[PDB]
């Protein structure tokens, strides 16, 4: 039987490619992987199907893109999505995204079309070893950038909810730490991004504790129509 010549996967946050069906898998085949949202109330997700062996989007081949829409609005990381890749015996590729609680789904089918040459396939395979270490470093960088954005999004939500728990003075220390994280996350030093996240965490520890204290006093001792 025939096999898939290159890995098939999906773009994930940070410009990275997650492999769903590995290179050299016999066809027909189907494999799934599970994913979630990045922001509070997210109702859509972009499903960008790629082909190749390397870690960054710019180093793989873009096959197709579509969106899953109608995701129920839930806190960041709360909606559960499964994406399934199917390649039939004739090489037809179907990709389906579906959300757990409502079953909402979107799918495409992509006809086999103008191939890769055997020599371009070989070259993409060989580049993946030749740039393996650079790619490991690039993925680590990008994953730290995603973590930075994750921390910033969570702070952004907490400020939206609970700005009233901070003085303008305390709020400026936080805003300055968050602006500085946001700046260094634009560069290419992984250790610096890590230290800036740690600084945001330390500057928000009291805020996070006042938010818990508030939920606990309220649940346990009760609410006041005052505030």
């Amino acid at each position: 039987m025939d096999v898939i010549p290159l890995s098939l996967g999906l773009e994930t946050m940070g410009g990275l490619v997650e492999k769903v069906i590995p290179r050299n898998t016999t066809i027909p085949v189907a494999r799934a992987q599970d994913f979630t949202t990045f922001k509070d109330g997210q109702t859509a997700m972009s499903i960008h199907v790629m082909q190749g062996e390397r870690e960054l989007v710019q180093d793989c081949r873009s096959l197709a893109r579509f969106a899953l829409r109608g995701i129920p609005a839930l806190p960041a990381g709360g909606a559960h999505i499964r994406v399934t890749f199917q390649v039939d015996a004739d090489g037809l590729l179907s990709v389906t995204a579906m959300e757990k609680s409502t079953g909402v789904e979107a799918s495409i089918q992509v006809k086999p079309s103008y191939g890769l040459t055997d020599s371009e396939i070989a070259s993409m395979i060989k580049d993946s070893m030749s740039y393996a270490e650079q790619d490991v470093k690039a993925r680590m960088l990008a994953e730290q950038k995603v973590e930075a954005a994750r921390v910033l999004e969570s702070l952004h939500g907490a400020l939206a909810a609970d700005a009233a728990l901070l003085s303008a003075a305390e709020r400026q220390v936080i805003d300055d730490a968050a602006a500085h994280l946001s700046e260094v996350a634009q560069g290419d030093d992984v250790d610096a991004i890590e230290q800036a996240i740690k600084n945001v965490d330390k500057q928000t520890q009291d805020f996070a504790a006042r938010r818990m204290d508030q939920s606990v006093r309220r649940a346990l001792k009760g609410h006041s129509v005052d505030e």
């Binding site: 997700m45 499903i47 999505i81």
Partner: peptide, 9 residues
């Protein structure tokens, strides 16, 4: 629209 985030390891 945002791409997916891995839901686990």
């Amino acid at each position: 629209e945002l791409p997916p985030v891995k839901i686990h390891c």
